[PDB]
Design a protein around this ligand. Sequence first.
Ligand SMILES: O=C(O)C(F)(F)C(F)(F)C(F)(F)C(F)(F)C(F)(F)C(F)(F)C(F)(F)F
Ligand SMILES: O=C(O)C(F)(F)C(F)(F)C(F)(F)C(F)(F)C(F)(F)C(F)(F)C(F)(F)F
Lengths: 114, 114, 115, 115
Amino acid sequence: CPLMVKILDAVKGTPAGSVALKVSQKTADGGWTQIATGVTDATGEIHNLITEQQFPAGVYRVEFDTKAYWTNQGSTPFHEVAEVVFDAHPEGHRHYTLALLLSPFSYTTTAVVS
Amino acid sequence: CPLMVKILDAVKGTPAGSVALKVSQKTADGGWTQIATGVTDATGEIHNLITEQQFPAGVYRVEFDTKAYWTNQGSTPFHEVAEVVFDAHPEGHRHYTLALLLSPFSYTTTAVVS
Amino acid sequence: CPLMVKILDAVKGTPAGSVALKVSQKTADGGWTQIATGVTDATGEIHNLITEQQFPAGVYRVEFDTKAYWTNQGSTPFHEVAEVVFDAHPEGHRHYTLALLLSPFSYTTTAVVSS
Amino acid sequence: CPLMVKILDAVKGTPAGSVALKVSQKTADGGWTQIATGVTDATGEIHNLITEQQFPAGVYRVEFDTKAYWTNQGSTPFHEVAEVVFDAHPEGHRHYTLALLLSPFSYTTTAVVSS
Ligand SMILES: O=C(O)C(F)(F)C(F)(F)C(F)(F)C(F)(F)C(F)(F)C(F)(F)C(F)(F)F
Ligand SMILES: O=C(O)C(F)(F)C(F)(F)C(F)(F)C(F)(F)C(F)(F)C(F)(F)C(F)(F)F
């Protein structure tokens, strides 16, 4: 699996479970095609989110529904959504992990690329 | 000024100068329309980005062109853009500061709401 | 002032008010001497934390009492304290802003250094 | 394995390998006893840093040598060290992961605590 996520909750010190997300692929005319959806497990991960065949070189957008997460936690969040947008070059079996650390009024995101 | 930004560079320990951004407003039909552009000064700020009259209650998107910033620093960035999306004045009019801390493969966003 | 702090609360989206801190200087023998204490105002800052006379080149430690901040906010925090340790004026005199973004189980710190 | 670390490099998008760190345990007299030292592997982790037997309830300090990490990357860093200080098993045994995201002038640190 070439695309992994890891979401953490900075208030509770746990992974962020049951966060919905959407993966979209940029098209030649600059629009977006949705190619996958998923919900994190209790470890803040989505196993087998997409296949290598579904992940050619191109720009991708991962939309995390953080507002619903915080609302369900009982906190009022600032952000309507958290989007991560990046150009992927998966040649050579290159894999991407998107890490996201959530607080109600902040988030940190980073990427680990191997 | 009801909407302020503050962008810092975590590689250099300075504000991030000359970062381009675009402000869009969510439309009634669920789309977006661009209402302002700007470029940070050497303190990482944009004075008079929009007026209070341009900033009524509703959802806004600020698109920060972090890829161009890092390219112009001679670094290779991960993200195509950094987007911050939020509902403004949902319980009354306030002032918003969007803070953004940039590294080539990571960013931290937070908001200070008056 | 040559050493400024800015503390923000990532749960509430406000500055972190009434955070206590201590500034110390590393001694020739490897110990620490306290040179200042302070408590942030409602903007998350401490005006006139130290003077230039108190800030010769060397290693300094700023200890932020984040555990008491969260305990008073009514949250249960992870860290006992948050410490920022840096060599000041290594290549000549500079001014320093230490920014700190607090959550109960996380913090981010960065520095803005200018000539 | 009750204490794990995970260090990432925010400039390169890789784990931070070969980071030296020290683990100290606070003593009743308010001092610190060093109980372990380690170096991260190429995944930014240290396997078998300490045993459950070495990790009773109490306050611990993990000192990460971030300055040497950046100095060897050829970068110029701000912080002299990054220290993480926390009270362990305050309400019963848990497992602790200390995560650290490094940039030359910033770091973010969070904890994941199991049950
Ligand atoms: O331990 C792991 O392997 C992990 F879960 F991926 C993680 F590194 F801890 C992480 F959560 F991704 C993370 F890096 F810590 C982070 F994403 F939370 C971060 F990098 F943003 C922060 F800054 F918090 F460390
Ligand atoms: O108040 C300011 O003008 C400021 F100093 F620029 C700042 F907003 F505090 C900041 F340092 F930029 C910041 F917000 F703290 C940040 F962006 F750096 C951050 F939020 F990312 C971090 F977490 F580092 F504090």
